[PDB]
Design an enzyme around this catalytic site. Structure first.
Site, PDB file in Angstrom:
ATOM      1  N   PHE B  84      -4.344  -6.269   9.502  1.00  0.00           N
ATOM      2  CA  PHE B  84      -3.660  -5.258   8.677  1.00  0.00           C
ATOM      3  C   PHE B  84      -3.443  -5.770   7.286  1.00  0.00           C
ATOM      4  O   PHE B  84      -3.653  -6.960   7.052  1.00  0.00           O
ATOM      5  CB  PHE B  84      -2.272  -5.009   9.210  1.00  0.00           C
ATOM      6  CG  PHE B  84      -1.320  -6.149   8.984  1.00  0.00           C
ATOM      7  CD1 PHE B  84      -0.674  -6.311   7.748  1.00  0.00           C
ATOM      8  CD2 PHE B  84      -1.029  -7.027  10.022  1.00  0.00           C
ATOM      9  CE1 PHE B  84       0.231  -7.335   7.554  1.00  0.00           C
ATOM     10  CE2 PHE B  84      -0.102  -8.056   9.836  1.00  0.00           C
ATOM     11  CZ  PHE B  84       0.517  -8.215   8.595  1.00  0.00           C
ATOM     12  N   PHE B  86      -2.723  -7.579   4.769  1.00  0.00           N
ATOM     13  CA  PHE B  86      -2.945  -8.775   3.971  1.00  0.00           C
ATOM     14  C   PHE B  86      -2.146  -9.887   4.606  1.00  0.00           C
ATOM     15  O   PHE B  86      -1.631 -10.821   3.948  1.00  0.00           O
ATOM     16  CB  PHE B  86      -2.942  -8.583   2.439  1.00  0.00           C
ATOM     17  CG  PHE B  86      -3.736  -7.344   1.955  1.00  0.00           C
ATOM     18  CD1 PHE B  86      -3.108  -6.324   1.253  1.00  0.00           C
ATOM     19  CD2 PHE B  86      -5.089  -7.205   2.193  1.00  0.00           C
ATOM     20  CE1 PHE B  86      -3.785  -5.205   0.810  1.00  0.00           C
ATOM     21  CE2 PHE B  86      -5.796  -6.065   1.744  1.00  0.00           C
ATOM     22  CZ  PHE B  86      -5.150  -5.083   1.063  1.00  0.00           C
TER      23      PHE B  86
HETATM   24 CU1  CUA Z   1      -8.435  -7.721   5.465  1.00  0.00          CU
HETATM   25 CU2  CUA Z   1     -10.074  -8.506   3.551  1.00  0.00          CU
END
Ligand code: CUA
Ligand code: HAS
Ligand code: HEM
Ligand SMILES: [Cu+]
Lengths: 33, 166, 557
Positions: B84, B86
């Site tokens: 997802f 970051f």
């Molecule tokens: Cu998740 Cu690039």
């Protein structure tokens, strides 16, 4: 005239790479598996 | 010359056609070989396995990342993940040395990737889906989760961890 | 009503000149970031600066989106439309319907710019694959559904010229380059659905405001339907040039009519049913569909494989002829001093490693080890970026004089070569650095330079990358003072313009008849072509459409 060494030295080298390259990886795929 | 060459040409181009084809199967051979041993595992989930990325975070086993590690046979372990935007859920993934692991990974947004520094765990994580790979680790220590899939701007800051305890 | 008496009684050069030039510009713009992207992987943050130069640049990714979309979609596309159109005629010294041809042109250009603007505004940074659910502007999908449809046109401009020649030359075999065009534009049709569906069915409602989500999975099985061939589409325009022309640049002859219809026969047959090597790593797709499109793909190496012989042999003989002597003698014998020639041939040597990447890439589980590292961009930079492009570029130095009547002066004949070699190294120096880093687990499409603490073994390909940067920059620019300066000067002396395109000849063959007929079976194989796709995107396309799972689109840039 006769036997075309050139093309061949080539499709070889080619061959040789595709080998250096495919075994090369295999091996790694493995080291990681 | 101009027709003398041609008979030969053609037939050399048989040598090739043939030789090519061999190598090739020799590959098809080996590829296939790997399909029969364990290292086959890192191959995703044949079968479909739908969820949705809205409800996913809120409920399901992806709700509570306390409950991600989950013993399923004397050595199997389903490990819910949420790739997802970051980060990955959880950080880190505590897992045992020399036992089978069974990652279950989905997104709550765009497609990310899930590639484990030192392995063939490497798999696309799609919003709306459960990707299922099996690896079995082998050495204690740490393993970075890179995400090799343009999740957007925190992209190149989308790594994670999996510790493989002793 | 023209100071140059062309576009009056022999003007299909009017259009091919155009398809061409824009193609080219495309290419200049989008590669403008190339060498940035190269230091980024070099590990140098050339963006602050590149941000200055171009105020309008929002994100690293926005560069890479132009860079990728401009050059590998746009530019490769205009080239086919330019070659696979202006050649086929000429072989047959007949005129392509010109209403369509400009409809064709304009269509793209609308499309290009109708497209382009979302993008420089940073309103569609979803990268040339536009993987839903990441959600770009409507004018971006729209601009490219136009653009592309616009070869749907050119499928027929050329099929017109088959239709027409074949009927009034009847019980006579389409000479190579129009038998070539035809399987190309043909095979490209089968392909062209994949994307086209994803756009009509999905990408276009979704974006315009019309549904609220697309299921990501068939997004990209539909996407990659086409998305594979389209490389083979980029490349074949150059396999034409190379197969039928190069040997006379070489100053020798195609050794074999059949083998070039044959390479091409394998193409239209085996090109489109393979988009699951691109998807070796997807979930919810039955392992043995992947295992197959393993073998299908593999079977598709067979052509370029067995091109590498035809081609190598043809240049062999030409070397012998103009002097060639040893095991490698025949090589210094060749035209080294002519760009028209040099470029594609470098493009070829480059091409050898890149072939070998392609394969690994296709050996299923092996891909687990590279799928989405620097590996891949190595691979194709080597392929489409060196080959097609060197091939395109080279063919400036005979297709301009021909197209323009303007003649290449020793000025830039000498500089063209400086460009060509000085770019060819780049590729290489870079290619090694991508493969390298790539094996090193370095993700691609990633502003790695912004986490400069991060890939500490990347150490050194990283130098290799950086250097390519500096070198390809030098390279790129140069090619502007070229492309531009070899067009800028008024000096046109179109005694040359009048166009004996340097075609090559055959070692006119024996089985060159009962056989080279079998390959002229056009429509038949074009049905095994459609037959195959039909099983390829068989119980997997049908499948997933039982269970679509649309999802909200996000814009995280
Ligand atoms: Cu998740 Cu690039
Ligand atoms: C124009 C373009 C391209 C051609 C060329 C190309 C060829 C292949 N590729 Fe590729 N590719 C893949 C597998 C192949 C295979 C099996 C081939 C085959 O066509 C290869 C056959 C070619 C050869 C075997 C070359 C033989 C050399 C010859 C024929 C010339 C000899 C030279 C001479 C004779 C000169 C001699 C002269 C003298 C004077 C000495 C895979 C995997 O299956 C991926 C995705 C992987 C992943 O994990 O994401 C992939 C990714 C790409 C994508 C990037 C993916 C993305 O953007 O998301 C594009 C850029 C691309 C383009 C192109 N690719 N490829
Ligand atoms: C000017 C010289 C060039 C340099 C220095 C260069 C360098 C690069 C680099 C370093 C990347 C990696 C970006 C990333 O992985 O984050 C990349 C991407 C790419 N390049 Fe270029 N490149 C050049 C020219 C070209 C050309 C001429 C083409 C067209 C044939 C091309 C096609 C592509 C494509 C299709 C991608 C990937 C698209 C995507 O990943 O979204 N490149 N380039
Ligand atoms: Cu491909």
């Amino acid at each position: 005239e006769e036997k075309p060494k050139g093309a061949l030295a080539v499709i070889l080298v080619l061959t040789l790479t595709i080998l250096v390259f495919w075994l090369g990886v295999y091996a790694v795929f493995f080291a990681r598996g | 010359d101009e027709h003398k060459a041609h008979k030969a040409i053609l037939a050399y181009e048989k040598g090739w056609l043939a030789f090519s084809l061999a190598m090739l199967f020799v590959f098809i051979a080996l590829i296939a070989y790997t399909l029969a041993t364990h290292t086959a595992g890192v191959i995703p989930a044949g079968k479909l396995e739908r969820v949705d990325p809205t409800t996913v975070r809120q409920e399901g086993p992806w709700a509570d990342p306390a409950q991600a590690v989950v013993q399923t046979g004397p050595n199997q372990y389903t490990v819910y993940v949420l790739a997802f935007a970051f980060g990955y859920q959880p950080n880190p993934i505590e897992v045992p040395q020399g036992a089978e692991i069974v990652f279950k990974i989905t997104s709550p947004d765009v497609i990310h990737g899930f590639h484990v520094e030192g392995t063939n765990i490497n798999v696309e994580v799609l919003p709306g889906e459960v990707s299922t790979v099996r690896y079995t680790f082998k050495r204690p220590g740490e393993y970075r989760i890179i995400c090799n899939q343009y999740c957007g701007l925190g992209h190149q800051n989308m790594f994670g961890t999996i510790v493989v305890k002793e | 009503s023209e100071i140059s008496r062309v576009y009056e009684a022999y003007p299909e050069k009017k259009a091919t000149l155009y398809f061409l030039v824009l193609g080219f510009l495309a290419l200049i713009v989008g590669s403008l970031f190339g060498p940035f992207q190269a230091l980024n992987y070099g590990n140098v943050d050339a963006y602050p600066l590149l941000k200055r130069l171009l105020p309008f640049v929002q994100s690293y990714y926005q560069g890479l989106t132009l860079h990728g979309v401009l050059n590998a979609i746009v530019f490769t596309q205009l080239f086919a439309q330019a070659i696979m159109v202006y050649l086929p005629a000429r072989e047959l010294n007949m005129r392509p319907n010109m209403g369509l041809m400009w409809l064709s042109w304009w269509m793209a250009f609308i499309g290009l710019v109708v497209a382009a603007l979302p993008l420089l505004a940073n309103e569609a940074t979803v990268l040339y694959t536009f993987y839903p659910p990441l959600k770009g502007h409507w004018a971006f999908y729209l601009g490219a559904s136009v653009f592309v449809l616009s070869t749907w046109v050119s499928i027929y401009i050329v099929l017109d010229l088959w239709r027409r020649w074949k009927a009034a030359n009847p019980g006579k075999v389409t000479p190579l380059v129009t038998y070539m065009a035809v399987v190309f534009w043909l095979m490209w049709f089968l392909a062209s659905l994949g994307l086209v569906l994803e756009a009509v069915l999905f990408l276009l409602p979704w974006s315009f405001g019309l549904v609220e989500g697309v299921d990501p999975l068939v997004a990209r099985t539909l996407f990659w339907w086409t998305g594979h061939p389209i490389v083979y589409f980029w490349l074949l325009p150059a396999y034409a040039i190379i197969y039928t022309i190069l040997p006379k640049q070489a100053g020798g002859r195609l050794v074999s009519d059949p083998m070039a219809r044959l390479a091409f026969l394998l193409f239209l047959l085996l090109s489109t049913p393979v988009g699951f090597h691109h998807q070796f790593a997807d979930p919810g797709i039955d392992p043995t569909w992947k295992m197959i499109h393993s073998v299908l793909t593999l079977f598709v190496a067979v052509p370029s494989l067995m091109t590498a012989f035809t081609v190598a042999a043809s240049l062999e003989f030409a070397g012998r002829l103009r002097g060639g002597r040893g095991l490698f003698g025949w090589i210094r014998a060749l035209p080294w001093d002519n760009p028209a020639f040099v470029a594609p041939v470098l493009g070829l040597l480059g091409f050898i490693p890149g072939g070998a990447g392609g394969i690994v890439n296709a050996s299923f589980t092996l891909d687990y080890v590279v799928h989405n590292t620097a590996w891949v961009p190595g691979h194709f930079h080597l392929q489409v970026a060196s080959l097609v492009t060197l091939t395109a570029m080279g063919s400036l130095y005979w297709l301009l004089p021909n197209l323009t009547g303007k003649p290449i002066s020793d000025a830039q004949r000498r500089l063209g070569l400086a460009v060509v070699w000085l770019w060819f190294l780049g590729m290489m120096i870079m290619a090694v650095g991508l493969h390298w880093a790539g094996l090193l687990n370095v993700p691609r499409r990633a502003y790695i330079a912004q986490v400069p603490d991060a890939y500490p073994h990347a150490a050194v390909p990283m130098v290799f990358n950086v250097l390519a940067g500096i070198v390809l920059l030098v390279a790129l620019l140069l090619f502007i003072y070229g492309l531009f300066s070899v067009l800028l000067s008024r000096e046109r002396k179109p005694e040359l313009a009048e166009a004996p395109l340097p075609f090559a000849e055959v070692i006119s063959g024996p089985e060159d008849r009962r056989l080279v007929l079998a390959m002229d079976r056009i429509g038949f194989w074009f049905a095994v072509a459609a037959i195959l796709v039909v099983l390829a995107y068989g119980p997997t396309l049908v499948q997933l459409f039982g269970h679509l799972n649309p999802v909200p689109g996000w814009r995280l840039w």
